[PDB]
Design a protein around this ligand. Structure first.
Ligand SMILES: Cc1ncc(COP(=O)(O)O)c(C=O)c1O
Length: 430
């Protein structure tokens, strides 16, 4: 690997603007009381894409990484022919994050969570002796599991039992990757809660979800790939959202590109989408409100079971936090759409038929967004549209593959006892 310099950056509290050094794994500005994201301010103001050998890290100028890891792949962006003609769009670009070797997409875990995994794991110290803790609906978990296993990084995953089928792998994992689950019936936020209980134990630290600049700047490489491929900033960004981290990241990528100057100065409009009937962020945005409406916990867990796109069901997303999704929608004049399971299933067939690879339900929600937006006359036919296919190639990939599944060492009730969880996760890594 090449003579690589850790990326220079400082941190900025979005709420105030306070600028300060990252002491390592800062996930908030401790001088700020309001909930606020921090954002990386990169010293390399102008993006210089490294050669392809760098894989995902070809974008490291704007990633908070101290090292590179082997075997990464970057988002692939290409101009659509099938889908574009079907929609009458002249400038439709697909940014594909998954397994589709024909176009050069080699994210073998089949989602853009690989950008999160490779970026976050590269931000961490390699002397780090604490166990990294990650909660996921499935896709983030599969990404960190692979990367952390390949690189002997201690990782505790918190995935809901109902989602553990997502934890498939070509080969048995390293024993440095351990998994615990919230019981059958719980959803992703229940898994967050289990992971926050486990974090009460010494020797464990949190990935932090959307609070981790590595996760956002990792995800933002879809937009970097798109802009550096197309040669300008798109007019529309379509992405199904569960936490909205990738939409926040897209916005942040847009701002950095504008500060860069060489690609124009327009602001990409965010077109984000949720799977009915789990549509809390959509409902709040339709209300013009920074506050999430009231969502009775049992109903939300049922709605989470109903939707096809299981990664889309987050009860506690970075919606209202300063710098979060509400702020990004307001800043980009963005729009929020809903897709039914039915629309999503049609969208998946459509994409397979016209672009030649299978995609996740979640990506199908975004595709459905696009179809409905176009049909409503919202998209100029010459508009530059980035469709972010956040996951694809699972069928394609599992084809004639013996798969190995990560199963939980412990399954806990929805409100576990702190003592039990702590003593068990402690035991897990001793
Ligand atoms: C395939 C897929 N679609 C949609 C999403 C939701 O994206 P976000 O994290 O920006 O909410 C994810 C998140 O991991 C995903 O993996």
């Amino acid at each position: 690997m090449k003579d690589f310099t850790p990326t220079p950056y400082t941190l900025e509290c979005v709420a105030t603007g306070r600028e300060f050094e990252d002491t390592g794994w800062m996930l908030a500005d401790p001088q700020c009381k309001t909930p606020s994201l921090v954002r990386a301010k990169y010293a390399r103001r102008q993006l210089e894409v490294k050669p392809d050998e760098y894989g995902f890290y070809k974008f490291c100028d704007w990633l908070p990484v101290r090292r590179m890891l082997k075997g990464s792949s970057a988002p692939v962006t290409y101009k659509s022919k099938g889908l574009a003609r079907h929609l009458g769009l002249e400038n439709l670009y697909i940014t594909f994050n998954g397994y589709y070797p024909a176009i050069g997409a080699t994210m073998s875990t089949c989602s853009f969570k690989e950008t999160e995994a490779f970026s976050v794991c590269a931000r961490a110290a390699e002397d780090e002796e604490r166990v990294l803790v990650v909660a996921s609906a499935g896709n983030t978990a599969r990404a960190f599991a692979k990367v952390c296993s390949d690189n002997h990084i201690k990782l505790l995953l918190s995935v809901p039992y109902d989602n553990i089928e997502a934890l498939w792998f070509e080969h048995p994992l390293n024993p440095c990757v351990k998994l615990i689950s919230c019981e059958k019936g719980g959803d992703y936020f229940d898994a967050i809660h289990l992971s926050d209980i486990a974090l009460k134990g010494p020797g464990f630290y949190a990935e932090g979800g959307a609070k981790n600049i590595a996760r956002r700047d990792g995800m933002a490489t879809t937009v970097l790939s798109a802009v550096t491929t197309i040669g300008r900033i798109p007019d529309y960004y379509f992405q199904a959202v569960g936490s909205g981290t990738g939409a926040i990241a897209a916005w942040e990528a847009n701002m950095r590109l504008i500060e860069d100057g060489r690609f124009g100065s327009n602001t990409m409009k965010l077109m984000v989408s949720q799977n009915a009937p789990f549509v809390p962020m959509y409902d709040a945005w339709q209300a013009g409100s920074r506050k999430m409406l009231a969502y009775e916990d049992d109903k939300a867990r049922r709605d989470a079971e109903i939707i096809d796109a299981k990664v889309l069901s987050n009860r506690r997303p970075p919606y209202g936090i300063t710098g979060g999704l509400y702020d990004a929608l307001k800043a980009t004049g963005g729009e929020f759409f809903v897709a039914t399971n039915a629309m999503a299933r049609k969208a998946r067939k459509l994409f397979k038929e016209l672009e030649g690879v299978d995609i996740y339900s979640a990506s199908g929600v975004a595709l459905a967004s696009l179809v409905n937006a176009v049909a409503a006359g919202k998209i100029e036919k010459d508009a530059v549209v980035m469709l972010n296919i956040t996951g694809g190639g699972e069928e394609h990939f599992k084809e004639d593959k013996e798969l190995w599944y990560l199963k939980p060492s412990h399954v806990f009730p929805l409100e576990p006892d702190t003592d039990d969880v702590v003593a068990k996760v402690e035991a897990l890594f001793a």
